[PDB]
Ligand binder design. Structure first.
Ligand SMILES: [Mn+2]
Ligand SMILES: [Mn+2]
Ligand SMILES: [Mn+2]
Ligand SMILES: [Mn+2]
Ligand SMILES: [Zn+2]
Ligand SMILES: [Zn+2]
Lengths: 253, 254
């Protein structure tokens, strides 16, 4: 029924990181090339975007996105929001219908979006996300609280899939919201500790507790070579890559 | 102390770039590489130094493309989004490891500074320097601010040695026209064919070009209204649309 597409699998500065001479930043492996982190979900002629990274224009062009039905935000950090400016051409009435391009965010994220963009017609409209499910064209997108260093942000569960980026930990109550998945995306930044993200080993431990059929890591930095890392991971656990497409089930009402 | 300098076009396109997302017109569908245009920016290299003019939302791609490993100074024309949003992506070049210890200096007029500090309040690695009408002394070279009018807002272009870079203008004051004579290289805004409230048309910028008589004039900030090769085939000798990746040699005192 539904399709998830990885628009970017990379960390906040992407892979390569500008100015870096490390082997991964010079890789001949295309999978080591990673735009900033975002996915899109398509179902029933609809397109739902999670986060608008600074690479949004390139992401949209290379996937031939010509219309967006809804945008949902995990949080307000620059690698997740700075592409909102480039969404504008698709918010024009000729494309929209119609009509509207709804943006869903919690109060913190909304405040950030307003500060960053209300100084610098494009009809977007802000909708508030609370802990209750978001109703999008028949589907329910359930906000899943996760801890991003100190700050609580959201990942999202939708049908048999879930997407959780930018976390250092996941509270027990949220772990219980993530059982029985077909597809699971988790933050996995690198091996060395980072206060607001999760290590590869940490995220493997999490994956082994949640037991999704397939688990994919994202927000990946230059510390994780794609091939080297994947041949060390368990059977149902892998690093995502840019362009990865996955099919799954989702119930519409 | 005249030395060889190189100007590189990092992006030759308008604010939404070429192609425009969602558009299926002839130019957006073009397979001519020069019809692919990132947001507008150039860099200037001389004496082992690199000076960047504007930080577009495409800055990461532009830097990777050109193998930029260090930025010695950044100079801003104005504060519109297509000229500033890439500052976030300047951060990995601003750490002591790469810089050598000093912050990356940014140069901007007061209105542009105001917008940068507001938008990138989380950033303020980098240090702000105020530009007025006096020349900017950068590593021996002088970058002269050239006032231009962007609708009704005054912004800056810059002249440096025998080159000048002027984007996002609808008009150029007389006093500024007088600053722009005898160039080897001149960049001018040319958005599209039809008059626009804040930009210059192809025809208008050709008229300006023929008044200023630079050896070579290049147009930038180009929209999908202008096919690259077909337009260049029709322009006067010495006048052409720029393209992403264009490199030009010129001279610079000190
Ligand atoms: Mn992030
Ligand atoms: Mn974050
Ligand atoms: Mn512009
Ligand atoms: Mn402008
Ligand atoms: Zn690296
Ligand atoms: Zn077009």
């Amino acid at each position: 029924r539904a399709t998830l597409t990885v628009l970017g699998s990379g960390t906040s500065m992407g892979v390569p990181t500008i100015g870096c001479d490390c082997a991964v930043c010079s890789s001949s492996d295309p999978h080591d090339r990673r735009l900033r982190p975002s996915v899109m979900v398509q179902y029933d002629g609809k397109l739902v975007l999670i986060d608008t990274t600074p690479d949004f224009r390139e992401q949209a062009l290379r996937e031939g996105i010509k219309k967006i039905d809804a945008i949902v935000y995990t949080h307000g950090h620059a690698d997740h929001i700075l592409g909102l400016d480039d969404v504008r051409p698709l918010s024009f009435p000729r494309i929209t219908g119609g009509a509207r391009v709804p943006l869903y965010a919690n109060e913190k994220t909304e405040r950030v979006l307003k500060h960053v963009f209300k100084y610098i017609i494009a009809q977007v409209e802000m909708h508030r996300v609370h802990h209750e499910a978001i109703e999008l064209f028949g589907a329910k997108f359930i906000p899943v609280p996760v801890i991003h260093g100190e700050t609580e942000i959201y990942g999202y569960r939708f049908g048999s899939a879930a997407y959780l980026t930018d976390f250092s930990s996941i509270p027990d109550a949220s772990m219980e919201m993530l059982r029985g998945l077909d597809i699971l995306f988790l933050d996995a930044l690198r091996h060395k500790p980072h206060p607001t993200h999760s290590t590869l080993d940490n995220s493997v431990s999490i994956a082994e507790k949640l037991k999704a059929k397939h688990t994919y890591f994202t927000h990946i930095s230059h510390d994780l070579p794609h091939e080297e890392t994947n041949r060390q991971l368990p059977a149902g656990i892998q690093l995502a890559h840019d362009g990865l497409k996955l099919e799954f089930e989702l119930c519409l009402e």
